[PDB]
Each structure stands twice: as structure tokens, then as C-alpha cells.
Amino acid sequence: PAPSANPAKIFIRRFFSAGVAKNVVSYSNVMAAQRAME
Amino acid sequence: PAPSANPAKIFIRRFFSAGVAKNVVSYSNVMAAQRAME
């Protein structure tokens, strides 16, 4: 079944990187969502 | 049952501190709730 080979490897080459644990949301967006609550 | 191990330990390490009896609402919020009654 599972082929383990998706075509989403276009990024990890150079455009992204493995083993660094990037955050999931920009801090600008976090602050916008915070201030939309007030 | 009772895993006791929740991912909510992020906050006691530093963002909070054990055994201090912090209040649940800001004093500004209490005064805001007070004046909102008149």
C-alpha cells in the first residue's frame, strides 16, 4: 500500500530543511489573532 | 486511565511557578466588572 514517496520533496532539497523544528505560525499572525480578541 | 502526563507542563517550568496561589482574574478586570454593574 503506502509508497512513502510523495511529490512534496520539492522543498526539502534547498527550499526547506530537515531537523530544525520550525514554528507553525508567524509571530505577526499570532499577534494579529491576539489583538483581534480585544 | 489517569495518565497524569498532560502536555500542559510548558507553563510551570518558567511561565508559572509552583506553590504561589496566583489569583484567577486581573484586578483591572474585577474593577471593570464592578463598574459594569452600575
Binding site: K22, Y27, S28 | R14, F15, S17, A18, G19, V20, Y27
Partner: protein
């Protein structure tokens, strides 16, 4: 205009000389314990046909006690940039506080000076200190530290005291592993480009904020690089009975309403702890 999430900091702690010392926990800030000074001699080898006896000499039971010292500080903000910031000052500034406490506690517990700080075992100077001989070179009498000393020091520990570890700055270990015999062969790790045995088996815990006799790793010593005799190199002690570290309450953070003048939100933090040297006979110091 493309701010990243990269937060390069490049700051270092020490190792931790905390899991070695005997840990004890107290609720209130004043404890007390007993001590056996000496059992003393009771009864001699008396002669026969003597309807008598001798009272000997009784022992001694001292009664000691020690306090617990506190640790506090203050930090604040302006409440204007904290609402617009591209970061979180508190979660960083709070993180900055134990990093100051964790490193201050360890060093003071090591080198504390009397009043309002636990007396470290360095300044106590009741650990027996062993100084090494100097060597000759071209008539000069420079002081040195050979591998022959290190084996002599670690082995000279009294066996009946128990098993004892060793503590030393890694620059000393690099100095030991890089020693050379007459021909040019290495002493340890002959022909593998690196000598690195499992320290846990040689019972040598390593640290990085000990006096570090090889100043910045630049005083191996043949001419004007001599070790400057009178410097700490390593220590060895049965730590689970030679030194105790007491704990009362972990750090706390409490907003300080009052003093905050609607511009300067001022936080307050503190912690209580302490330490004291037990029987400082288990434990010796190597010196140059």
C-alpha cells in the same frame, strides 16, 4: 523586512555539581542535626586477680544546625513596546531568571563566602589539599603536573571511606590525554587519534567552571607558561556524605502591584535554598 524565527543566542551554562552532593529537603528555614565527635576509649586490658575496673573516658555527641539562605531579584518593563513587540519579553525574561539562579546557586555552593551564602567547599579549606612536586628543565625548576601524579592522587583515597568520584575542568582532561612519552608515543589511547574512555566507568565527572589551572588552555608549561604553582586542578570526594545541598522552595514569580506606576510593570522573583559541608574528611584536593 522579512524577519525570521531564528533566535541564535550562543550562551553557555556550566555542568551541574548538584546530583553529586547529598540532597536533603526541609520545610521550614531552620534545621538541626546530630554528630558523633568520637566514640572514645572504654575499658583497658587490665591484669588478672584484680577485683576492680576502670571507668575509661566517655565519648562526645555534638549538636549542629544550619540555616537556609534566600535568593531574590527584580526586573521590569515599560508596557508600551510589550504590546507591539515582535517577541515575548516575559517568556524570555523569565527564562533569563532560572538561568541566573541555576548558575549562581552552583557557583556559590562551590565558592560561597560565609555570610548570607552557603559556604562552599573551596573557601572552607578544610578539605585536605595535596600539592604536587615541581620538575627540572635545563636547570630551571618550573612546576608541572604529570600523569604520574594523577594516578597517585586518585589511588591515595582511603578505601574504607567508600567509592569517590573526581571533578575537574575539561582542559585538564585534554592536558592528560595529550601527554607524550620520551619517544613520541601517547600515554593513553596509543594510536587512535583520540583518547576518550567512558568517564562514568573511570568515575570522573567533568565540569567547566572550576578554577581551570591551564588558563584558557594556554599554560601547558615549558618556559613562561608554567602552571603558576598554587592553582586548583582537580578534586575528589565521597560527595553523598562530604557535602549536602538543602532545598526549601523553588523559584516563584509574583507581580508587584504598587511600585508599578502605570508605566513600569515590575515583576518580582525569589527562591530559598542552602548548603553546608558535612564531615570534610571524605574528600581531598589536588594542587600544583
Amino acid at each position: 523586512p522579512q524577519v525570521l524565527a531564528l533566535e541564535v543566542d550562543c550562551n553557555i551554562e556550566c555542568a551541574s555539581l548538584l546530583d553529586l552532593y547529598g540532597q536533603i529537603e526541609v520545610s521550614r528555614s531552620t534545621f538541626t542535626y546530630m554528630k558523633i565527635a568520637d566514640y572514645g576509649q572504654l575499658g583497658e586490658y587490665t591484669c588478672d586477680a584484680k577485683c576492680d575496673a576502670e571507668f575509661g573516658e566517655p565519648g562526645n555527641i555534638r549538636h549542629l544546625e544550619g540555616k537556609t539562605y534566600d535568593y531574590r531579584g527584580v526586573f521590569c518593563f515599560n508596557r508600551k513596546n510589550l504590546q507591539e513587540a515582535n517577541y515575548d519579553f516575559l517568556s524570555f525574561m523569565i527564562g533569563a531568571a532560572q538561568r541566573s539562579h541555576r548558575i549562581n546557586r552552583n557557583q556559590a555552593l562551590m565558592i560561597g563566602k560565609g555570610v548570607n551564602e552557603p559556604k562552599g567547599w573551596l573557601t572552607e579549606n578544610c578539605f585536605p589539599v595535596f600539592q604536587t612536586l615541581p620538575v627540572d628543565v635545563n636547570g630551571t625548576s618550573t612546576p608541572a603536573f604529570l600523569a604520574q601524579d594523577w594516578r597517585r592522587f586518585v589511588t591515595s583515597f582511603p578505601a574504607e571511606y567508600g567509592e569517590a568520584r573526581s571533578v575537574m575542568h575539561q582542559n585538564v582532561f585534554g592536558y592528560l590525554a595529550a601527554m607524550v612519552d620520551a619517544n613520541g608515543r601517547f600515554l593513553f589511547g596509543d594510536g587512535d587519534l583520540t583518547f576518550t574512555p567512558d568517564l562514568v566507568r573511570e568515575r570522573i565527572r567533568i565540569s567547566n567552571c572550576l578554577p581551570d589551572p591551564t588558563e584558557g588552555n594556554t599554560k601547558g608549561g615549558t618556559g613562561q607558561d608554567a602552571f603558576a604553582a598554587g592553582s586548583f586542578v582537580a578534586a575528589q570526594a565521597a560527595w553523598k556524605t562530604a557535602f549536602y545541598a538543602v532545598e526549601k522552595r523553588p523559584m516563584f514569580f509574583e507581580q508587584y502591584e504598587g511600585g508599578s506606576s502605570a508605566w513600569c510593570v515590575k515583576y518580582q522573583f525569589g527562591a530559598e535554598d542552602g548548603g553546608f559541608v558535612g564531615c570534610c574528611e571524605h574528600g581531598r584536593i589536588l594542587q600544583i
